[PDB]
Amino acid sequence: SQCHHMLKHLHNGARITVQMPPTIEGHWVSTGCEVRSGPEFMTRSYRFYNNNTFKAYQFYYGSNRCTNPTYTLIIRGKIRLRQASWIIRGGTEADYQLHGVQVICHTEAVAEQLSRLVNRTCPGFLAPGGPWVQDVAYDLWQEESNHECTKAVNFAMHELQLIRVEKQYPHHSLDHLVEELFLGDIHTDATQRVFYRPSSYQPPLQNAKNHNHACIACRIIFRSDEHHPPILPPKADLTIGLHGEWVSQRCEVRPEVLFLTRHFIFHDNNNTWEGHYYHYSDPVCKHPTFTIYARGRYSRGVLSSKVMGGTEFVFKVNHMKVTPMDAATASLLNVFSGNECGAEGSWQVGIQQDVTHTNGCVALGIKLPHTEYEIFKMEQDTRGRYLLFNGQRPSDGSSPDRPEKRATSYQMPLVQCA
Ligand SMILES: *[C@@H]1O[C@H](CO)[C@@H](O)[C@H](O)[C@H]1NC(C)=O
Ligand SMILES: *[C@@H]1O[C@H](CO)[C@@H](O)[C@H](O)[C@H]1NC(C)=O
Ligand SMILES: *[C@@H]1O[C@H](CO)[C@@H](O)[C@H](O)[C@H]1NC(C)=O
Ligand SMILES: [Cl-]
């Protein structure tokens, strides 16, 4: 349970086998109320058939608890697995074709808002005297009319272009197999979604044959359909008391910067925080590259009016240290810290060093102090362990350096370790 042990044995010490190319045939379902940027509160129910065809449900909701369905998208098409990604090691690229996008509204208020918005976005879509009514499926992608209005909901299915299936087993055994389908991540800027080729992953979907059995959401979503959306349990929101230590549960993938694990320490006495960011080149986080240590201060919590269930925080980084973890990294840091700004840093593999030099010249152009506007939430897993979520990093590689760039979605959770 110690933070170091949990960072050495990610995901409860489970062993993963990745079959490349993956087998995606089956019914894949969400494990909870997912948050896409927006915010968009949703769950997924994806069927991939042996005919390389697909039926995907996207159930949307009005709240972070996924208890009041608003509208549901039924997406049909075909998928074609291509070659293994060279951008994201462990991922397989795929190509897809959409063949239909249907929408069903679940309340009369949503039926009215959506029909009006689609008509505003695509002036001719709707006939003169016929507003949408609830519980009726409506074609948003009318194919053979060459007229579509997926732009009204800023819809894109590019998540299907990056695919990874992990077979997870607790202990070195072939028992209690959980199959997880990772699909491409969703851009944090909804306008850029139709242009975004995924470079990381959404939260994993679980297989209907090989799912965690304590996952109540999984069963609710398995048995759902477009007319009976999954009603998730009305769990109460927990109050964020940023305290203790937290570590990554998985080897996380971030766009362009490769793979990583995190260790956070919060000091509720003086509202100070520390973070370790262990960077790796491999999708199993066994081949390290460099490590970053950050320390600073954080503000008090304010409940968000933009993301239900979120608590807004302001974080300030005052001090930062870097540890090279391979010869290439130490060499690069030595070449730049010396041949340009500064004189000597003697970067060494495994040796931590501050990036603010005594003369105040920071290496690689880092700007300290740095302020980030964060969003946090705390949940519990099926074993009751607390989980800490912070804001999804902006997809372009930018930092949430202004309040208007604060995330409306979250990263993969950290789990409490002390
Ligand atoms: C593919 O065959 C499956 C049965 O394996 C069927 O359910 C599905 O309708 C077919 N393709 C389409 C249109 O999704
Ligand atoms: C919009 O919808 C109304 C009501 O359904 C309909 O009368 C009208 O023709 C539509 N057209 C435009 C341009 O919005
Ligand atoms: C805050 O308190 C912690 C002890 O919990 C201590 O390690 C740290 O140095 C303190 N920071 C400041 C700025 O006082
Ligand atoms: Cl972070």
Numbering used by the authors: 50 to 467
According to the publication:
Adenomatosis polyposis coli down-regulated 1 (APCDD1)—a conserved single-span transmembrane protein containing a large extracellular domain—negatively regulates WNT signaling and plays important roles in hair follicle development, CNS vascular development, and glial differentiation. The APCDD1 ECD consists of two closely apposed β-barrel domains (ABD1 and ABD2). ABD2 contains a large hydrophobic pocket that accommodates a bound lipid. Collectively, the results of this study suggest that APCDD1 serves as a negative feedback regulator of WNT signaling by neutralizing WNT ligands.
To determine the three-dimensional structure of the ECD of mouse APCDD1 (referred to hereafter simply as “APCDD1”), we produced this domain as a glycosylated secreted protein using human embryonic kidney (HEK293) cells, crystallized it, and collected X-ray diffraction data to 1.95 Å and 2.15 Å resolution from two crystal forms. Attempts to use molecular replacement for structure determination failed because of a lack of discernable homology to known structures and the low quality of predicted structures. Therefore, we produced, purified, and crystallized a fusion protein between engineered maltose-binding protein (eMBP) and APCDD1, collected X-ray diffraction data to 2.3 Å resolution, and used molecular replacement with eMBP to obtain phase information. Fitting this model to the electron density map of eMBP-APCDD1 provided the starting point for iteratively solving the structure of the APCDD1 half of the fusion protein. Molecular replacement with this structure was then used to solve the structure of APCDD1 in the two crystal forms described above. ABD1 and ABD2 have, respectively, three and two intradomain disulfide bonds, a large area of interfacial contact, and one interdomain disulfide bond (Cys52–Cys466). This structure is observed in all three crystal forms (eight unique APCDD1 structures), with a global rmsd of 0.7 to 1.1 Å among structures. In particular, Gate-1 side chains show a concerted inward shift within the ABD1 pocket and, together with multiple other side chains in ABD1, largely occupy the interior of the superimposed ABD2 pocket. These distinguishing features of the ABD1 and ABD2 pockets are observed in all eight APCDD1 structures. A comparison between the bound and unbound APCDD1 structures shows no major conformational change upon lipid binding.
